[PDB]
Scaffold this motif. Structure first.
Motif, mmCIF file in Angstrom:
data_model
loop_
_atom_site.group_PDB
_atom_site.id
_atom_site.type_symbol
_atom_site.label_atom_id
_atom_site.label_comp_id
_atom_site.label_asym_id
_atom_site.label_seq_id
_atom_site.Cartn_x
_atom_site.Cartn_y
_atom_site.Cartn_z
ATOM 1 N N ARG A 1 24.541 51.484 -12.968
ATOM 2 C CA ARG A 1 25.556 51.701 -11.963
ATOM 3 C C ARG A 1 26.547 50.524 -11.887
ATOM 4 O O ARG A 1 26.156 49.374 -11.858
ATOM 5 N N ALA B 1 15.488 51.043 -6.528
ATOM 6 C CA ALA B 1 16.437 52.123 -6.306
ATOM 7 C C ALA B 1 16.273 52.790 -4.923
ATOM 8 O O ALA B 1 17.235 53.330 -4.399
ATOM 9 N N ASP C 1 17.810 49.030 -2.526
ATOM 10 C CA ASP C 1 19.090 48.419 -2.839
ATOM 11 C C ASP C 1 20.114 49.543 -3.089
ATOM 12 O O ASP C 1 19.930 50.395 -3.984
ATOM 13 N N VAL C 2 21.184 49.556 -2.300
ATOM 14 C CA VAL C 2 22.220 50.600 -2.451
ATOM 15 C C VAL C 2 22.929 50.505 -3.799
ATOM 16 O O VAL C 2 23.357 51.521 -4.334
ATOM 17 N N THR D 1 21.526 49.638 -6.793
ATOM 18 C CA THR D 1 20.684 49.926 -7.944
ATOM 19 C C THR D 1 20.390 51.404 -8.019
ATOM 20 O O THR D 1 19.880 51.992 -7.089
HETATM 21 K K K Z 1 19.796 52.930 -4.654
#
Ligand code: K
Ligand code: 6VC
Ligand code: 6VC
Ligand code: CL
Ligand code: CL
Ligand code: CL
Ligand code: CL
Ligand code: CL
Ligand code: CL
Ligand code: CL
Ligand code: CL
Ligand code: CL
Ligand code: CL
Ligand code: CL
Ligand code: CL
Ligand code: CL
Ligand code: CL
Ligand code: CL
Ligand code: CL
Ligand code: CL
Ligand code: CL
Ligand code: K
Ligand code: MG
Ligand code: MG
Ligand code: MG
Lengths: 200, 233, 216, 196, 202, 234, 213, 239, 123
Positions: G28, G183, G186-187, G189
């Motif tokens: 991402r 995931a 963490d926004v 990941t």
């Molecule tokens: K995430």
């Protein structure tokens, strides 16, 4: 960080913790804060890790050139002076470095404190880093020029230990070195968790 | 009179050809590469018994793994030697590894034709260097001897002589060299050859000798160690 | 540029089978004022490559001058080598990064579309040198309003026809006209295929205002 | 924080300086020396910002020594003071100002003893006695009270000791030891440290 | 300041108010903001008086030299390009909003805007300066394709008068210029000659 | 005579003797051969050894993944020019993320090497290059000279007794385009072998080979690695 | 105040084995509260024996990797051999420090084989401080990954467990597990996990899907 | 001696170094340009000094801007350097003034650069002469020639190199003002074949380029099929 | 700035400017040095005598620093330049090393200054 060093009858003791931090995050518990400038000269690292590593590595380069050009070992005085003269030009630009240059030369055991503020001073004992205040207390109450070798190792190890206890920013292991007339030796690496067990 | 960057009709730079002739006014030096290490040997050429022989230094340490023997105009060699030293330390600083003998030789050889009087800084080099150099050392390729002259041409050699009697010495080197020769044989051979070509009677104060081996750092032979090797020779 | 002056809003791009389409309105705004209402914010770079720019229009004109001259210089050589869309995108990344690193940015966000060797190219470069490729792109408010619709369609059907990509771009332009207060209902659509680059316009979307009577 | 003092009598100049190098809340050295020998009959005492102090003093020192080697004889105290001043003033508006305060003490064969005071701005004043540091605020009035121009060197050391005892009593900083030197016709003499 | 220029078939009309201000003091009430750059190329100046004078002088020099070298009258587009290069390059150090208008034998009457920031665009008509805000509506409703010279002069004088009534920062007299192949005709509208529109009293 | 010491002095015949003299530096270097097919570009070089105990001078140098050179003349000038070439290639990958086309690199050499031929107190470069490369327009062999001229070649040889090599290459050049790699390198070796005294032969000690093509980054073969190519000159 | 930096997200991880190194990253690329693309890996092949992971400000990631690539070729040209993993690490330290007063906003982790064929991991701060590690997480979710690795690879805080060598198969399982956990929280990941495995045979690639929210 | 520096006049007021540079151009094989009703056509007799060279090697025809061709004779490295100067001048003009450089102005600017190399001991004169050709609807067809002294003039027809005079006498036979580019290419090829000394230099390639109404004002190589037809016409006309 | 190459090679490897510099030294007054066991001595000839000379002003023996001195033969103006350069350098050494120079250190410095003036343009 906590680092210390002292001159005594049998040379100079040098010790450090092994923690690195980024703000309050513990980045490492295994950092080597004592750098081998040559076989008879050590530098210690406190402050910005990149800054200490870069400038002490450059010091090592310069000392080696000096040796090749002049056909003799650089003195502790001259090595500490090279480092001071290098960083002086950068005062006010945000370098953060506090180092002890520790050796044995023609004047005997040598110990200089050098930092990014421009200080350069010789002395019998020093401690540097956020934990230095805690190390000074224990080092000062046990220090003597006439310490026996094993008593000197015990003192250094204990002073760093006690600093790791009070100072959130010091920890990991205590790494200890002894500068002798024929070279420095690595004396021990003791995890603070194992020292805790022993001292109680 | 013509400029320093003038070609002759044969396609050579006059100044470089003349600098090559200056090498022939130098004392003889010898290098030999064996699988056990390299040795460098040089005639001191003492001109008065009042001169201190230890003040003649025609073999120098570049780094722990690299030595250098010189012949020709010795004063000219100082800036080349210092450039070699600085380069190996820079390479250590940057890459945390030892620089190869070939790489050191290349770095120095890139100074060679940097002379001239209307491209460069207010007082840049006016002429080439009147010096030839043998770089002997050990790196991950094993033991290695390289030759360089004032043209900036450099090349690996199994054995090489430079200076006044290099023809002569080079011929004896072809005769005695073999790929499986030991270091101790190479040391003896080079002293035997220096002994032939030197005007003075060879002894333990009017020559220098150094080695570099896979085990062991650059080592200048002491008076006492030279005397030992001189007994047989 | 420290302070942008006349500026352009969103640029959209989407890959399709055999090419790339980009879209941009024809407005240069001066703060909120819709000041220059007939300017093109799209450049034909060469036969395989096109570029659309958001942000400061004077900075766009400078890039157009520089990049135009670079293509001409290359064509003079007549040597069978041309800058690919990927090369132009690379050059642009370097130029923006370099200007960012001097603390004097070119105040633009760009969308590079191309077609070369059977492959559609679509790449983004911003004023800081942030660059990447993707199957669809949208700068400015397009990143919030258009990109969700582009990506939702692309998940159900990653390979679009030219006519599907064109209809999807028109729907996005409509949304932007409804919801971006610096947009304008006069736009261009540029397309790159095997045949080269075509720029169409001026174009308008139909709009629906039925909701104006659905309040009480 | 750093204290310098000088007292000039008829044929000598007496000087002293604290021996502390401090950092944050700790003394890091208790035998620090703030005096620089410029020549056989000249001392420069230098305090101020870290780095600047040693860099500045050693530069002046090397140049005073160079002058001797070039010419066969030494700069006078007054010439050395004016040389020091020219350098500091010339740097004041440069990219490399030096934030240092100084005393220069000397003895000239023909002019006798001299004590000069200089601040970081490079104002130069000749004085019969002087001091630098926060400690000066507590000791200058003691000097004004008891100094006379014919003061003997014994009494100067007593007067000095009154000043230093006042710092022990009244000053908030821990300055327990001081270097003491005197300059006269026969050069520079080390006296015993004064300690508490 | 309010500035304006309009294209017609065979030439251009340019116009400006005549007010120079510092804060709300009027330092010159009869300023000439239409400056000749060559025989048939003018610029209308807005923003800093110092900046626009310096830039206009420099471009006059460059264009003059260029013209002698080529032995031909200069292109209006060339004049605009020279302004643009200087206004763009020095955009962080200048406060300059310029209209370049004139006539040349190759492209006829042309109007270019070089607003602050140093972009350049050709337009049928252009307005600029702080007073222009108040006439966008007016010009948008009143502009017609194919106006004669005389209609462009009236259109300009009207637009400027309206701006001058409402903008404290604009005023004084209206200066007009018409440029065509035959030359330059300048005039001043003052006092009662300025177009008049009532205050809407009860 | 009065006309032969300065690169800035035209002779009354419209010649520049300093440039002609610089070209003699290349004619006295050891021979090198370059040739190409539809798919590969090859360099072959004879290496001169000073004594029986010296290695043999490098003749073939890497420039980029798609470009290598063979040199004849002053070695220090060869390195300076090779470093310029390397840097121009690195710049092109940095800026454009693609290989520098070979013909553009050669143009840059022409322009760089011309400059000192026109300024007082400067000298020509005393080196000639054979340049092998592969790009979108296929394989290339170029030749560069101390005059700053350059040539696009079907094949070429420069250096001492290279006339013989050139005569062989003309004789067989109608075959080169259709050759497999092995055939093409063999042709390079036979051309180079024409430059040798009748006594002497190609060996693993004196031959150096460079190859680049569609499927192959520029690769140098020396010493034991040239043996596959030398066996079967049958 | 033009800011020359923006944060673009990214989590990186490297693990040293006895005869392997793993370097892994999510794919991402973000800015503010938006996703630029879901397919932007943070790992770059340097040599056959060395991979680098880079996260932080993407403009600097791109520039720095292109600098490293040019420098590796320059080295190879001057010294006639490929740079070792250790020499790349030392060189990177100096490149980072050259921007000490306008830093590269990049967290770097190198994973490769050392000269004895053993796994080697080197981790860096933005101005070029570095050391060798046994394993290391970096970037956006590093504080989420690192403790679990300390515990599971380092055996920290555990009594009565054999300190066995780390197998490739277990190292792989750990890598996937920690990114899956990251995931969740963490926004930045998400999208996909790219794994590079460096061994004597070369570099191979696995990809695993992550949550797209 | 009076002929060693471009900063020294001889006693008769000559600058021999510039004359010597001219002799290098006059040793070169021949290039011609012809202006006609709707464009300019260039031809070069390109001597092939080795059969090992590629067709196309050592071009003597250059594009210096999209609308401007350049044809050269003399020392080829010098000519290429001048082509780069011409290109930079055209590029800089477009950046500064915003339109394509007029041919005459380009000719004059490059001629002043050539001229600057004829004043000083520090540098030598260029050993090359070159022609510049363009076409546009506004300016029509233009052909300029510049020599090593930096003199620049416009021409209906022009030839440089060793058979210059023989070429000019053939060019004078054409009513070029009334002919088209398509007609003139054949006559350019014809003239090159006439002045080529087939005994003394054995092998040549004909190089052709043009700029005109038919190329929309772009300078371009003559297409291969048209070149071959022109050669075939020239060869058979030689008979 | 004047950048002529002054010291150049000639056929056979000679540097004529250097050989001519050595001829200048050979016409200078004789100077002698002896190294004792714990003393070092320098003596020098003449040069002119001349009753009206102030003797102090023409000495050919010079302190470089406290622990190093020198004598010279050759061009006296040239010697004054070399001496002052070496005096500056002795103070840099003390400044950066905090020891006096070794005699070999300052010799090596003077020698490399001399060598540079045989290989630099304009000198
Ligand atoms: K995430
Ligand atoms: C130490 O002074 C310590 C000494 C250092 C040689 C390791 N300094 C640091 O840990 C500094 C403190 O800011 N940290 C850094 O330079 C950044 C380190 C790596 C960060 C990651 C992003 C990789 C003490 C007392 O500060 C240690 O707590
Ligand atoms: C105009 O833009 C006008 C145009 C100018 C070219 C005459 N600008 C000004 O009057 C400007 C302020 O905007 N004034 C000056 O540059 C100051 C000149 C003198 C300064 C001293 C008196 C201090 C309008 C709309 O701004 C006019 O109001
Ligand atoms: Cl540890
Ligand atoms: Cl040194
Ligand atoms: Cl101290
Ligand atoms: Cl700390
Ligand atoms: Cl020799
Ligand atoms: Cl518009
Ligand atoms: Cl376009
Ligand atoms: Cl005004
Ligand atoms: Cl504006
Ligand atoms: Cl405006
Ligand atoms: Cl305004
Ligand atoms: Cl008014
Ligand atoms: Cl060769
Ligand atoms: Cl050579
Ligand atoms: Cl040639
Ligand atoms: Cl040849
Ligand atoms: Cl001619
Ligand atoms: Cl010097
Ligand atoms: K008003
Ligand atoms: Mg300061
Ligand atoms: Mg201003
Ligand atoms: Mg989400």
């Amino acid at each position: 960080t906590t680092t210390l060093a002292f001159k005594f009858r049998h040379g100079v003791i040098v010790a450090a913790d092994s923690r690195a931090t980024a703000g309050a995050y513990i980045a490492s518990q295994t950092v080597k804060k004592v750098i081998e400038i040559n076989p008879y000269l050590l530098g210690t690292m406190a402050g910005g890790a990149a800054d200490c590593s870069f400038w002490e590595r450059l010091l090592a380069r310069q000392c080696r050139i000096y040796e090749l050009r002049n056909k003799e070992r650089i003195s502790v005085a001259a090595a500490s002076k090279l480092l001071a003269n290098m960083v002086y030009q950068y005062k006010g630009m945000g370098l953060s470095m506090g180092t002890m240059i520790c050796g044995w030369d023609k004047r005997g055991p040598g110990l200089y404190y050098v930092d990014s503020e421009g200080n350069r001073i010789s002395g019998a004992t020093f401690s540097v880093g956020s934990g230095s205040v805690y190390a000074y207390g224990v080092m000062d109450r046990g220090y003597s020029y006439d310490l026996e070798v094993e008593q000197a190792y015990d003192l250094a190890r204990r002073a760093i230990y006690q600093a790791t206890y009070r100072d959130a920013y010091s920890g990991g292991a205590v790494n200890l070195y002894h500068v002798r007339e024929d070279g420095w030796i690595r004396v021990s690496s003791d995890n603070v968790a194992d020292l805790h067990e022993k001292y109680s | 009179d013509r400029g320093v960057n003038t070609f002759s009709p044969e396609g050579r730079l006059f100044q470089v050809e003349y600098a090559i002739e200056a090498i022939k006014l130098g004392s003889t030096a010898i290098g030999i590469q064996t699988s056990e290490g390299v040795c460098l040997a040089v005639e001191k050429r003492i001109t008065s018994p009042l001169m201190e022989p230890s003040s003649i230094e025609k073999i120098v340490e570049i780094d722990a793994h690299i030595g250098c023997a010189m012949s020709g105009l010795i004063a000219d060699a100082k800036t080349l030697i210092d450039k070699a030293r600085v380069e190996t330390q820079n390479h250590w600083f940057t890459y945390n590894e030892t620089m190869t003998v070939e790489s050191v030789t290349q770095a120095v050889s890139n100074l060679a034709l940097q002379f001239g009087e209307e491209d460069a800084d207010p007082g840049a080099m006016s002429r080439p260097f009147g010096v030839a150099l043998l770089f002997g050392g050990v790196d991950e390729k094993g033991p290695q001897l390289f030759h360089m002259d004032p043209s900036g041409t450099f090349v690996q050699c199994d054995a090489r002589a430079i200076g006044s009697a290099s023809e002569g010495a080079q011929s004896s080197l072809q005769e005695v060299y073999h790929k499986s020769m030991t270091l101790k044989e190479a040391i003896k051979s080079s002293l035997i050859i220096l002994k032939q070509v030197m005007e003075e009677k060879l002894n333990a104060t009017n020559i220098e000798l150094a080695t570099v081996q896979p085990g062991q750092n650059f080592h200048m032979f002491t008076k006492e160690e030279l005397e030992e090797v001189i007994k047989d020779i | 540029t420290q302070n942008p002056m006349v500026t352009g809003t969103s640029v959209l791009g989407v890959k399709f089978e055999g090419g790339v389409v980009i879209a941009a309105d024809m407005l240069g705004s001066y703060g909120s004022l819709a000041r220059f209402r007939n300017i093109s914010r799209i450049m034909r770079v060469n036969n395989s490559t096109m570029l659309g720019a958001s942000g400061d229009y004077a900075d766009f004109q400078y890039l157009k001058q520089v990049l135009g001259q670079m293509v001409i210089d290359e064509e003079l050589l007549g040597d069978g080598h041309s800058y690919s869309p990927r090369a132009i995108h690379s050059w642009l990344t370097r130029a923006m990064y370099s200007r960012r690193s001097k603390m004097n940015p070119l105040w633009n966000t760009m969308v590079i579309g191309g077609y070369a060797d059977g492959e559609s190219f679509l790449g983004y470069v911003d004023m800081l040198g942030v660059a990447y490729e993707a199957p669809s792109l949208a700068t400015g408010y397009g990143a919030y309003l258009a990109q969700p619709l582009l990506r939702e369609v692309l998940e159900k059907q990653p390979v679009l026809s030219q006519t599907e990509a064109r209809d999807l771009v028109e729907r996005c332009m409509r949304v932007l006209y409804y919801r971006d207060a610096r947009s304008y209902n006069r736009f261009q659509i540029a397309t790159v295929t095997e045949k080269g680059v075509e720029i169409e316009g001026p174009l308008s979307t139909e709009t629906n205002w039925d909701i104006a009577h659905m309040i009480s | 924080m750093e204290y310098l003092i000088g007292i000039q009598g008829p044929d000598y100049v007496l000087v002293a300086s604290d021996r502390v190098a401090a950092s944050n809340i700790v003394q890091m050295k208790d035998d620090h020396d703030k005096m620089f020998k410029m020549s056989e009959k000249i001392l420069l005492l230098c305090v101020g910002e870290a780095g600047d102090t040693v860099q500045f003093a050693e530069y002046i020192q090397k140049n005073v020594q160079l002058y001797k080697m070039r010419n066969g004889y030494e700069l006078s105290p007054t010439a050395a003071a004016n040389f020091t001043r020219r350098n500091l003033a010339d740097c004041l508006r440069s990219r490399t100002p030096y934030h240092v305060n100084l005393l220069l003490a000397g003895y000239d064969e023909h002019e006798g003893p001299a004590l000069y005071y200089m601040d970081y701005l490079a104002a130069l004043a000749k004085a019969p006695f002087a001091a630098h540091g926060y400690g000066a605020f507590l000791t200058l009035s003691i000097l004004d009270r008891y100094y006379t121009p014919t003061i003997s060197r014994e009494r100067a050391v007593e007067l000095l000791r009154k000043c230093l005892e006042e710092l022990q009593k009244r000053f908030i900083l821990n300055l327990p030891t001081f270097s003491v030197r005197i300059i006269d016709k026969n050069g520079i003499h080390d006296l015993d440290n004064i300690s508490f | 300041t309010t500035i304006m220029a309009v294209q017609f078939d065979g030439g251009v009309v340019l116009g400006a108010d005549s007010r120079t201000t510092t804060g709300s003091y009027i330092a010159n009430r009869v300023t000439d903001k239409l400056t000749p750059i060559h025989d048939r190329i003018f610029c209308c100046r807005s923003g800093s008086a110092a900046d626009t004078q310096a830039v206009a002088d420099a471009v006059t020099y460059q264009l003059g030299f260029h013209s002698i070298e080529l032995n031909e009258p200069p292109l209006v587009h060339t004049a605009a390009s020279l302004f643009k290069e200087m206004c763009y390059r020095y955009r962080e150090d200048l406060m300059a909003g310029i209209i370049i208008a004139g006539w040349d034998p190759q492209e006829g009457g042309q109007v270019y805007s070089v607003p602050m920031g140093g972009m350049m665009v050709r337009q049928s008509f252009a307005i600029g300066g702080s007073g222009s805000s108040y006439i966008y509506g007016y010009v948008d409703a009143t502009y017609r394709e194919g106006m004669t010279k005389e209609e462009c002069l009236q259109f300009t004088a009207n637009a400027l008068a309206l701006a001058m009534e409402r903008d404290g920062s604009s005023g004084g007299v209206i200066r007009l210029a018409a440029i065509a192949e035959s030359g330059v005709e300048r005039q001043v509208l003052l006092g009662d000659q300025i177009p008049k529109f009532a205050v809407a009293t009860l | 005579n009065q006309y032969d010491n300065d690169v800035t002095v035209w002779s009354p015949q419209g010649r520049i003797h300093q440039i002609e003299y610089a070209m003699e530096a290349v004619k006295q270097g050891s021979a090198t051969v370059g040739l190409k097919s539809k798919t590969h570009a090859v360099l072959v070089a004879l290496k001169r050894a000073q004594s029986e105990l010296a290695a043999h001078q490098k003749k073939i140098l890497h420039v980029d993944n798609h470009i290598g050179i063979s040199i004849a003349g002053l070695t220090a000038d060869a390195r300076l020019l090779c470093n310029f070439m390397r840097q121009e290639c690195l710049d092109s990958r940095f800026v454009f993320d693609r290989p520098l086309p070979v013909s553009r690199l050669v143009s840059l050499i022409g322009s760089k090497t011309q400059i000192p031929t026109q300024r007082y107190g400067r000298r020509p470069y005393g080196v000639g290059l054979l340049i092998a490369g592969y790009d979108d327009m296929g394989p290339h062999i170029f030749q560069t000279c101390p005059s700053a001229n350059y040539f696009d070649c079907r094949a070429m040889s420069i250096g001492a007794r290279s006339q013989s090599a050139r005569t062989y290459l003309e004789r067989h050049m109608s075959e080169f385009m259709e050759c497999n790699l092995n055939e093409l390198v063999k042709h390079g070796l036979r051309a180079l072998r024409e430059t040798l005294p009748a006594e002497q032969d190609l060996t693993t000690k004196n031959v150096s080979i460079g190859i680049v093509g569609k499927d192959l980054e520029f690769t140098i073969y020396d010493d034991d690695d040239v043996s596959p190519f030398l066996e079967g000159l049958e | 105040r033009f800011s020359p930096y923006v944060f673009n997200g990214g989590t990186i991880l490297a693990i040293a084995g006895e005869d392997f190194a793993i370097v892994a990253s999510d794919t991402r690329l973000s800015e503010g509260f938006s996703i630029h693309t879901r397919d932007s890996p943070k790992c770059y092949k340097l040599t056959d024996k060395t991979v680098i992971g880079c996260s932080g400000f993407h403009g600097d990631c791109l520039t720095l990797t292109k600098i490293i690539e040019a420098r590796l070729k320059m080295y190879k040209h001057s010294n006639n051999k490929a740079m070792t993993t250790g020499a790349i690490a030392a060189m990177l330290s100096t490149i980072l420090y050259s921007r000490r007063f306008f830093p590269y906003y990049v967290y770097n982790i190198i994973g490769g084989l050392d000269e004895e064929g053993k796994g080697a991991v080197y981790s860096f701060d933005p101005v070029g401080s570095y050391q060798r590690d046994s394993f290391k997480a970096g970037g956006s979710a590093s504080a989420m990954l690192q403790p679990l690795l300390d515990n599971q690879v380092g055996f920290k805080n555990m009594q009565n467990v054999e300190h066995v060598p780390l197998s490739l198969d277990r190292a792989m399982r750990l890598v996937k597990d920690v990114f899956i956990s990251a995931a969740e929280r963490d926004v930045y990941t998400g999208d996909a996990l790219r794994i590079c495995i460096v061994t004597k045979e070369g570099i191979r690639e696995e990809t695993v899907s992550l949550r797209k929210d | 001696g009076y002929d060693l520096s471009a900063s020294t006049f001889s006693p008769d007021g000559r600058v021999f170094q510039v004359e010597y540079a001219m002799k290098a151009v006059e040793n070169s094989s021949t290039a011609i340009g012809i202006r006609c009703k709707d464009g300019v056509v260039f031809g070069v007799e390109k001597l092939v000094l080795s059969k090992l060279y590629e067709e196309g090697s050592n071009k003597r025809l250059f594009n210096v801007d999209r609308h401007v061709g350049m044809a050269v004779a003399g020392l080829l490295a010098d000519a290429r350097s001048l082509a780069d100067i011409a290109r930079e001048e055209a590029s800089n003009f477009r950046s500064n003034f915003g339109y394509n450089i007029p041919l005459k102005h380009l000719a004059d600017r490059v001629a002043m650069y050539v001229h600057a190399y004829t004043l000083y001991s520090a540098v030598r004169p260029f050993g090359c002469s070159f022609m510049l050709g363009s076409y546009s609807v506004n300016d029509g067809a233009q052909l300029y020639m510049i020599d090593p002294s930096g003199v620049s003039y416009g021409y209906w027809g022009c030839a440089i190199g060793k058979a210059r005079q023989a070429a000019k006498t053939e060019i004078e036979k054409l009513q070029m003002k009334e002919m088209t580019c398509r007609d003139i290419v054949k006559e350019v090829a014809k003239i090159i074949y006439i002045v080529h000394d087939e005994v003394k230099d054995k092998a040549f390639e004909l190089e052709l380029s043009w700029v005109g109404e038919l190329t929309n004002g772009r300078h371009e190589i003559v297409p291969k099929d048209i070149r071959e037809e022109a050669e075939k016409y020239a060869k058979e006309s030689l008979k | 700035s004047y950048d002529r190459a002054i010291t150049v090679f000639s056929p056979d490897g000679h540097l004529f400017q250097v050989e001519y510099a050595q001829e200048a030294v050979k016409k200078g007054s004789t100077a002698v040095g002896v190294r004792g066991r714990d003393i070092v001595v320098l003596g020098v000839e003449k040069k002119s005598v001349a009753k009206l000379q102030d003797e102090r002003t023409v000495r050919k023996i010079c302190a470089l620093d406290d622990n190093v001195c020198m004598a010279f033969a050759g061009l006296t103006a040239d010697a004054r330049i070399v001496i002052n350069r070496a005096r500056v350098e002795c103070q840099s050494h003390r400044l950066t090393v905090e020891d006096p120079v070794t005699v070999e250190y300052i010799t090596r410095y003077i020698a490399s200054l001399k060598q540079r003036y045989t290989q630099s343009n304009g000198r």
